């Protein structure tokens, strides 16, 4: 679809068999989700944002469906203020900016 | 134009008589700019992201040109590591997400 930006670009995602809401975030290199249980192995990592750095669990090669489009990539889980979908997955679903 | 998201969507902006590089960021409600000594009145504000909050100065009715597209609105100035064009101005230049 074409998404205007008068409201937050919030969409429903499916990950680990569970539905969630997440923000399409072109300013994020990576995808960061709030604390949750995910199956498989993970590795501890750090990620930095506007206010500093947080510890996250890195899950690689995770199936995630975004607004009806499938992606398989890295998902970081940790104390992010909101679920954000970053460019690593936005590219997979064919997302572009247009003006 | 159309901007793919393989790399950060950085564009040139003009504000306060200065040219800068900034992110077209659908994940930001507001526009956040690196420290710069703009004239005029302002109101303190705090915005939160990954890592916590930073203190910024809110300036209103600021003229800003983004890829030759003119806009005017609120800009937040503070110790951000990157210049961020948020939805308050992306809507004014006709920017959409498409997939
Ligand atoms: C809460 C949702 C997100 C987190 C909100 N942010 C926008 C988001 O695009 C930031 C921009 C950014 C920040 C610092 C460095 C690089 C890019 N990207 C980001 O953190 O990405 C992470 C994951 O991938 C990596 O790549 C880049 C960093 C890593 S914000 O800047 O903190 C923000 C908070 C409140 C407001 C107010 O106006 C009300 O909205 C405006 C903006």
Automatic annotation (TrEMBL), chains A, B:
Major location category of this protein: host cell
Coiled-coil zones: none
GO cellular component, one term: host multivesicular body
One Pfam family it belongs to: RVP
Topology class, membrane: Lipid-anchor
Keywords tagged on the record: Aspartyl protease, Host endosome, Hydrolase, Protease
Lineage, uppermost ranks: Viruses, Riboviria, Pararnavirae, Artverviricota, Revtraviricetes
GO biological process: proteolysis
Matches recorded under InterPro entries: Aspartic_peptidase_AS, Peptidase_A2_cat, Peptidase_aspartic_dom_sf, Retropepsin-like_cat_dom, Retropepsins
Compartment(s) of residence: Host endosome, Host multivesicular body; Virion membrane
Example GO molecular function: aspartic-type endopeptidase activity
Stated name of the protein: Protease
Domain called Peptidase A2: residue spans: 20-89
